[PDB]
Amino acid sequence: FPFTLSPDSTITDYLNNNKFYVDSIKHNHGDQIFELNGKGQSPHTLWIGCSDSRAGEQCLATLPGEIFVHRNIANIVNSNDFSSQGVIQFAIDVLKVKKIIVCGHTDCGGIWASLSSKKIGGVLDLWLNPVRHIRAQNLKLLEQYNHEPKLKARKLAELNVIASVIALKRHPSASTALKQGKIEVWGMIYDVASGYLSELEIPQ
Amino acid sequence: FPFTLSPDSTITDYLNNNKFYVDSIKHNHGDQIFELNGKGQSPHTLWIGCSDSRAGEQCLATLPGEIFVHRNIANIVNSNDFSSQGVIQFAIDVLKVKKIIVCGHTDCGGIWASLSSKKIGGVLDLWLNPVRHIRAQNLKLLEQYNHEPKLKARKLAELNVIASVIALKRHPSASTALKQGKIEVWGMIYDVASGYLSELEIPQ
Ligand SMILES: CC(=O)Nc1nnc(S(N)(=O)=O)s1
Ligand SMILES: CC(=O)Nc1nnc(S(N)(=O)=O)s1
Ligand SMILES: [Zn+2]
Ligand SMILES: [Zn+2]
């Protein structure tokens, strides 16, 4: 009801809110935006975030052709995952992006699951292992957040974003581009209960 | 630049765009949306589309908390990829999504890249192999359209979307959920030069 679509929504329902979209841009910006999207893309930023339906890059309200997006569970950058590492290769080599964002978010069930032992099944257990490694690397800290669980999940969330950062900093194309200074990289948290973005201090 | 941001944009410019984004949803919907998001997420759709800066789910004009998203290069579903297969497991088994969408698009360079004889390099060459294997699998058809490559790409991008759809139906959860009729799956194309979506027939 409050959301724009519903599970009962018919195919044409979806296409209607698409017809809107098209209409909305053609009013605020005319045909210029779509003439450029058809010619080519020159995005200034690549977004690496979690697949959560609330933490999408929509939180930056951008026109198409501006943000290169990659989204998976728990916004993890695994060096041994050809999906992410391949995106980085293209974002830097060909498009020459000028800013890379990796964004976790509050209420990331992928984090709350990592703090649990209850096996999940299928690939998720293995896919979430890189965060479990953080849970162990920083328990001496995390154990203190016992009676305050919400703060526990937030801290591990930030650490996961920090880990995903250092992982992307070690990518050859990213490493070669930083030392030259032609790229910036930021870490951020999307607060799901407020819509605001918070930058994360990144250690060296 | 008619775009909202610019490659020279500072960090402060990104926050303002976010602050804006927050203002719109509150103005038009109050604190309601971010109060629901703050509690949890119950999206109705799984979006699996290319990562292109122009083919993002924003072409549905949806609010946060509606679309569980995953995006990679060329919108490919390979049963040997942890990230994607893990998203499919979570979307159907837990979130109990009602409809899934696989969306290629036009001018998808990953398709055009698979239409050249030279290698790309890095980890990208072997990420695109599923597409190249489809170009080979259907050259009887790709043997036409050589008159105009634009039409050829439109067909391969199509075929790629299709293939990704059946591979998705091969997921255990997906196979189980579809047989029970507890879920739908659609295949679409996002025409980048006009912003309209186009449904694609998906055979058996
Ligand atoms: C097993 C697992 O990953 N659990 C999930 N819970 N929430 C998720 S989210 N915020 O990435 O959509 S994933
Ligand atoms: C040129 C190449 O190697 N492929 C890419 N071209 N477009 C891509 S996109 N639209 O999926 O981001 S990837
Ligand atoms: Zn998450
Ligand atoms: Zn593409």
Residue numbers in the entry:
A (entry chain A), B (entry chain B): 32 to 235
What does the article say, verbatim?
Fungal carbonic anhydrases (CAs) are metalloenzymes that catalyze the reversible hydration of carbon dioxide and play an essential role in fungal adaptation to environments with fluctuating CO2 concentrations. The opportunistic pathogen Candida parapsilosis expresses a single β-class CA, CpNce103p, which is structurally distinct from human α-class CAs and therefore may represent a promising antifungal target. Mass photometry and X-ray crystallography revealed that CpNce103p forms a stable homotetramer, similar to its homolog CaNce103p from C. albicans. In summary, CpNce103p shares fundamental structural features with other fungal β-CAs – a tetrameric assembly, the Cys–His–Cys zinc site, and a funnel-shaped active-site channel – while differing mainly in peripheral regions.
